[PDB]
Amino acid sequence: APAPFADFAPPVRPQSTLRRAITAAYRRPETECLPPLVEAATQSKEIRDAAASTARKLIEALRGKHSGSGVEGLVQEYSLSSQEGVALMCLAEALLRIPDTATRDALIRDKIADGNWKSHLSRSLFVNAATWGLVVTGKLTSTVNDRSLAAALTRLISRCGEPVIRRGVDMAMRMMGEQFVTGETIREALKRSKELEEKGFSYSYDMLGEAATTAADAERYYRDYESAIHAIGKASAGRGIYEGPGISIKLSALHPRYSRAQAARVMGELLPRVKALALLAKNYDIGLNIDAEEADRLELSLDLLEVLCLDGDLSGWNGMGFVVQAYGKRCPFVLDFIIDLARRSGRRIMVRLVKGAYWDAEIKRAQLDGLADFPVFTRKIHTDVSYIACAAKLLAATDVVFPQFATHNAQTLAAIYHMAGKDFHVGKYEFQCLHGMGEPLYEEVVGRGKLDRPCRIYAPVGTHETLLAYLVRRLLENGANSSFVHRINDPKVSIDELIADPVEVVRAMPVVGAKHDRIALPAELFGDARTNSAGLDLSNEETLASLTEALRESAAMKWTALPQLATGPAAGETRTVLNPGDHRDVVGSVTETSEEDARRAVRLAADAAPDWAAVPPSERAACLDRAAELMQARMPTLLGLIIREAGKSALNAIAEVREAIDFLRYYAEQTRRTLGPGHGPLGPIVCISPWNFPLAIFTGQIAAALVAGNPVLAKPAEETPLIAAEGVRILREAGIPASALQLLPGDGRVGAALVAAAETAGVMFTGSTEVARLIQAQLADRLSPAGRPIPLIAETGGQNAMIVDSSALAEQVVGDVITSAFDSAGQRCSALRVLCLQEDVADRILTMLKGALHELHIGRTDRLSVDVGPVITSEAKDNIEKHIERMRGLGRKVEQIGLASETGVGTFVPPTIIELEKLSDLQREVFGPVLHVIRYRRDDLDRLVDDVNATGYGLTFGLHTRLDETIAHVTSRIKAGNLYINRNIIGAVVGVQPFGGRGLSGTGPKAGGPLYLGRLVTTAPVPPQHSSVHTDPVLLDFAKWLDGKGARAEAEAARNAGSSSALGLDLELPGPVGERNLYTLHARGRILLVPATESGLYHQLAAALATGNSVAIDAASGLQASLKNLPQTVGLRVSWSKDWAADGPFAGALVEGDAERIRAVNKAIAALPGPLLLVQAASSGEIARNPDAYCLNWLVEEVSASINTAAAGGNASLMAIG
């Protein structure tokens, strides 16, 4: 048996002094990066004056030849609105998908121009409207208002006819064939390059591949590069690497798992492919440049650059090139490494200095990951100073490297032109620019009549489909408010402003290098409310080295879990806890609780309840905050335990510990916002938790109950007692008294013994719906000492769907599907179970999905390279496999990864894709790595949403579409608690996506949300921000009816319920950039009313209607005559039920009666099929005395919606931040 973590994440090679200096700068504070860059970028006053003069001359030339764009002239000629211009370009794009010119022209003339375009053109015309919106308006709108565009297109065609369609088609043809690309094919691009090569320009061709999803994709990009190198080398015809053309490649195009976590596969499989392309470039003697991509790929790419430059088979050729990004904090240290590598190898490395193309994505990623700082600067001027400083370094090393200064900024250009001084020869250095963007500037640079410096044009090559895929990211490079190209086109920007010297501006700032004011550090995402949890950068070699040792040390510890009663640990039956990925690996030992001691623990909790309730709320919250600090400090050790006990990967263990820290801090802050003397605790609360989030959900339930003033009996899942015991140790260290928090390890009958104990005042359950139903039945024969039902929070299973239409980007979909379905071996309650693909795109996405499936690494999770770990037990494995084989036996197509022999020592299920005929083929939640796929016709979308709802579950739900009409339709009709738009459906974040479902998926209130603590006290406080100015109109009609009947007091109570209801609350919660996180209060559905008196019925109806609900009223109440002559609006919401089980499912219940009536009704309600119902009961006298006898918190339904607003390829809000 391999030693735990002995091979967790060894680096590709020992890290040199130069490599370590790179890693040390990864997230260095911005104030620390800038001073040395200012120093390096400083130039003489004479040079600065000369540079400003040169920059002014260039800018005066640029503004002097600047004409209106073709799209602007089109909009002007036909008086188009912005939406019409966008709609026109989308139509033109669609018409150009018709390959035959005569056919297209006939369609335009005979069909498109003469009325209905809809009849003639499965795929919305407006799939790429966000891109065309950037072209027309200069502004990025993340999703497409396709109803507005359809109206605009009808309007413009009916107004202007064939001539405007013709002009749009010709414009789009020119832009997509000659501007966004140099040519559709490498041969076409080469033909069109002669003109500017004759003027002194050169070329590097960008074949536009990136982000391979499958082996087949990577092979396709490889053969595309190979064929392009032949065409370029044939055309180069011996011109060499400086005068002649070259190619640029992206390493992410050449392997589907290009990442540090897969470093071994990258060096074994990706590196030989790059070497083969480099060998071909060497034979033709052309440049081959490695483009720079995301920050977490920088250092990995250095290992490829190193091997290639040391490889003797490539000797004699100086064409190997490499991009470094000046917006990155590591840039000068990366250059030091490259310059030294060039010296050692004797290869004159071609170094393209750029600023960087992924800025807004890097901001979002660091925030999501809770990392210490950003790997890029946050003020644009800092990137400018960094660029100039790094140019000074490169210009001092032209004997060993070939600097290539890629920029469209005339100030940057001028500064470097004068920095380089008087001596020049071709081959010393060059400038670079983008095709269709930089030529106006560089036609003032190239040539003996200008500055006589060469410029290499980066020339995209590809079809319409290929160029549109990431055109948004390219547009933002030069189209943001801080971009030079955007500013030179802004008449409100003066030339004096444009020639401002970034070096001297930064030098004169009060705090040199300060972070941008409007960008939050990840730790400060929530501002004054609470401190964000911190993650770990698994791309950072120092972090991986430190984590390796902490994880190894964690595996040497003798972890135990004992029954920790108030009086001390108790004796019991002891057994080992085994690693689910390798049963030979003993993680620790658990002593499980006898049923006698579980009953004893509840009595001790009851005796201790007054002492814990008397700890003031702020001090209880301080315990939670101290516990969060302790978990943050101990995260590395906690990771190792979760990895080995629960079969989790390192990434998932980090997220798990982060969620625990976030629960502690969120419930502490919510406590400080709400809890006072009148919010009395329930009493002893039994917290029963599942194995699959063995620290986060465990901690969340306990922390909430404790901080609300309740002593807790913690019963962790039998599979995962060790991390639970450590959580309890931490909470006790943080100041939770032993009498307030008792740990009772064991199985379901320890849980049941706790639930059944006479002093149990509340139950918090997360687990399967079947077990929650058994707990519900147990509690149905129970009343509190005050004669009211024992509160139960029961958060249960899901049958989670994702709907994908033909507007979604397949690569994005597949990544989100692979993550949502197979992360944690599908053992998240949020996991994607049913993928629903629009028929027109289903086969293409399915092929990509299966290809991505086979790139997953399954194994014991103490290796960073493992993507999917084991299932938790052999019983879980057998249950999942039985489902798979049943499906296979029915003839359903089944796709499965092959498992390595090493998995035999643990319990593994291979990630599996099962193609279903209809959603009804699924009967129960299958809690494993099993994705089901169904197909749907676009016209049947509404029926499909019905089918998803018809399972009765309602936990997580995903939608991939660009189309506002589809977003509005689907999100209004789906019934689920957590919605996700254009992103994955897992990893809901505390206080950002409050988590919890409806129907068979939960009772609520949501964990990680503002209603949670109020369920754990006898009188609920008013949550922060919890109110609504909207009044339900049926409630109003009912109040008027009551006044008409003479029931004046009930009418007043109804109006009060209408005002007090928070139905219609609609909030945006603070979170990361590039995401909109929404929280809304809706009706629950149909509420079962069990009244006893006429006044009681009126109060129950007022409560239910004020919260937007319909009702079913118990016909056995005999109160039919109390509701005569209702207004039709109210009658529509009212039904009478003799057979409650026939008229469900309900979403809650209100009960009136004495204690034994309540107990009887509670038993009958628990026996209803389907969802657990959140029941509220009151006596007739309570209804008369207490306006809040029925609490309106529990009659609304919380919905969380998380929208990825960066999905179109950039962040509109961050285009204004520089």
Ligand SMILES: Cc1cc2nc3c(=O)[nH]c(=O)nc-3n(C[C@H](O)[C@H](O)[C@H](O)COP(=O)(O)OP(=O)(O)OC[C@H]3O[C@@H](n4cnc5c(N)ncnc54)[C@H](O)[C@@H]3O)c2cc1C
């Ligand atoms: C020939 C060529 C090759 C290129 N190759 C690559 C490549 O392989 N990898 C790559 O990542 N990109 C590449 N780029 C893009 C380049 O990195 C820039 O994104 C783009 O060209 C605009 O920079 P600029 O000097 O032209 O103009 P500018 O307007 O001077 O600079 C714009 C840049 O400033 C930076 N910036 C904007 N806002 C902020 C902020 N708030 N904080 C910090 N920095 C900010 C961004 O990097 C932005 O792109 C290439 C560009 C060219 C012309």
Ligand SMILES: NC(=O)c1ccc[n+]([C@@H]2O[C@H](COP(=O)([O-])OP(=O)(O)OC[C@H]3O[C@@H](n4cnc5c(N)ncnc54)[C@H](O)[C@@H]3O)[C@@H](O)[C@H]2O)c1
């Ligand atoms: N909605 C959510 O937030 C959420 C979160 C995570 C998991 N889940 C659900 O949890 C399920 C998987 O987790 P699990 O396998 O640990 O669930 P489970 O139902 O098998 O057990 C959960 C806990 O209940 C206890 N238990 C079993 N029988 C009991 C009984 N008769 N009385 C009292 N307690 C009893 C168990 O010991 C365990 O601590 C899945 O259905 C998943 O969807 C839901």
Ligand SMILES: O=C(O)[C@@H]1C[C@@H](O)CN1
């Ligand atoms: O959404 C998810 O996957 C996790 C599980 C719940 O605790 C909420 N956060």
Ligand SMILES: [Mg+2]
């Ligand atoms: Mg179980």
